[PDB]
């Protein structure tokens, strides 16, 4: 079924159209995912000029079908079960004492490539807050992403908190509320409650002259015994 599409390395493309406080931008990403290992390797470029928000604030928006589901949890992997037609992923992300992002994405195959196409709208940001002021460290914490069948028993409702390190040594919370709904109408796996355990490392390409982010991530499902 959809799980079979992920047994080796799969190319990824990401495209994001954003508008935060009227500052418009676009981001393109490319790389590969290896769900057997829960690994992602990607590079993202801002194709419109300078990114008006910090790269770390966009990590969660910029393919949870690449999470590693251990064998005893495979009946809980909604994300691969929806493929290849894919799913809609919607979020609101509330930055404590600052503005919010609202995002809508479609994640699906296009040919042999897994594509994440996103629209993002951010509003009510402070002009010199941590986000528009670029006051975040260039790194990423490790998180638990909590997953539960949705009310309609059609997709999943997801909740978690991201912690962004700030350059003054404090931490700013980004409270995530997420819904995923299959694009096709045939059966998908509806999971028992569980979570994903995430870790990420960010870097730069020394030869890349555009504003950009190199991202490597490891994600493993857990919380079923
Ligand atoms: K700054
Ligand atoms: K900075
Ligand atoms: K890390």
UniProtKB/Swiss-Prot annotation:
Q: In which tissues is it expressed?
A: Photocytes.
Tell me what the record says results from residue 217 to G: Suppresses the 399 nm excitation peak, leaving only the longer wavelength peak at 475 nm
Q: What is the effect of changing residue 140 to F?
A: In Sapphire/H9-40; exhibits a huge Stoke's shift, with an excitation peak at 399 nm and an emission peak at 511 nm. In Azurite; shifts the excitation and emission spectra to shorter wavelengths and increases quantum yields compared to BFP
Effect of changing residue 28 to R: reported as:
In mut1.28; shifts fluorescence lifetime from 3.03 to 2.76 ns. In mut2.2; shifts fluorescence lifetime from 3.03 to 1.94 ns. In mut3.3; shifts fluorescence lifetime from 3.03 to 1.88 ns
Task: Quote the PTM field.
Answer: Contains a chromophore consisting of modified amino acid residues. Maturation of the chromophore requires nothing other than molecular oxygen.
Does the UniProt entry include the keyword Methyltransferase? no
Protein name per the record: Green fluorescent protein
- Entries under InterPro entries matching the protein: GFP, GFP-related, Green_fluorescent_prot
Q: Among its keywords, does the record have Metal-binding? A: no
Q: What is the effect of changing residue 64 to M?
A: In Citrinine; leads to excitation and emission peaks of 516 and 529 nm, respectively
**UniProt effect for mutating residue 193 to I:** In mut2.1; shifts fluorescence lifetime from 3.03 to 2.50 ns
Which keywords does this Swiss-Prot/TrEMBL entry list? Chromophore, Luminescence, Photoprotein
Substitution effect: residue 145 to I = In Azurite; shifts the excitation and emission spectra to shorter wavelengths and increases quantum yields compared to BFP
Summary of the protein's practical applications: Green fluorescent protein has been engineered to produce a vast number of variously colored mutants, fusion proteins, and biosensors. Further generation of mutants led to more stable proteins (at 37 degrees Celsius for example) with brighter fluorescence and longer fluorescence lifetimes.
- Which Pfam family is one of those matched by this entry? GFP
**Might you name a Gene Ontology BP term for this protein?**
bioluminescence
Function of the protein: Energy-transfer acceptor. Its role is to transduce the blue chemiluminescence of the protein aequorin into green fluorescent light by energy transfer. Fluoresces in vivo upon receiving energy from the Ca(2+)-activated photoprotein aequorin.
Q: What happens on changing residue 67 to A?
A: Increases fluorescence at warmer temperatures such as 37 degrees Celsius. In GFPmut 3; highly fluorescent mutant when excited at 488 nm
Q: What is the effect of changing residue 148 to T?
A: Increases fluorescence at warmer temperatures such as 37 degrees Celsius
Question: Which proteins does it associate with, and in what oligomeric form?
Answer: Monomer.
What gene name is listed for this protein? GFP
What family does the database annotate?
Belongs to the GFP family.
Mutation effect (residue 37 to N): In EBFP1.2; shifts the excitation and emission spectra to shorter wavelengths and increases quantum yields compared to BFP
Q: What is the effect of changing residue 141 to I?
A: In ECFP; leads to cyan fluorescence, folds faster and more efficiently at 37 degrees Celsius and has superior solubility and brightness
Reported impact of residue 98 to E? In mut1.27; shifts fluorescence lifetime from 3.03 to 2.85 ns
């Amino acid at each position: 079924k959809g799980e079979e599409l992920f047994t080796g390395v799969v190319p990824i493309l990401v495209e994001l159209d954003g508008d935060v406080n009227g500052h418009k931008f676009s981001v393109s990403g490319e790389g590969e995912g290896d769900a057997t290992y829960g690994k992602l390797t990607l590079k993202f470029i801002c194709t419109t000029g300078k990114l008006p928000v910090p790269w770390p604030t966009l990590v969660t928006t910029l393919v949870q079908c690449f999470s590693r589901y251990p064998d005893h949890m495979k009946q809980h992997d909604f994300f691969k079960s929806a493929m290849p037609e894919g799913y809609v992923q919607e979020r609101t992300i509330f930055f404590k004492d600052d503005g919010n992002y609202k995002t809508r994405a479609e994640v699906k195959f296009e040919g042999d490539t897994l594509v994440n196409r996103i629209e993002l709208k951010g509003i009510d940001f402070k002009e010199d807050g941590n986000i528009l002021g670029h006051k975040l460290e260039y790194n990423y914490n490790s998180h638990n992403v909590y997953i539960m069948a949705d009310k309609q028993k059609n997709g999943i409702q997801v909740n978690f908190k991201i912690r962004h390190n700030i350059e003054d040594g404090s931490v700013q919370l980004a409270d995530h509320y997420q819904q995923n709904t299959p694009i096709g109408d045939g059966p998908v796996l509806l999971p028992d409650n569980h979570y994903l355990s995430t870790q990420s490392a960010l870097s730069k390409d020394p030869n890349e002259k555009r504003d950009h982010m190199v991202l490597l991530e490891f994600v493993t499902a857990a919380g079923i015994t």
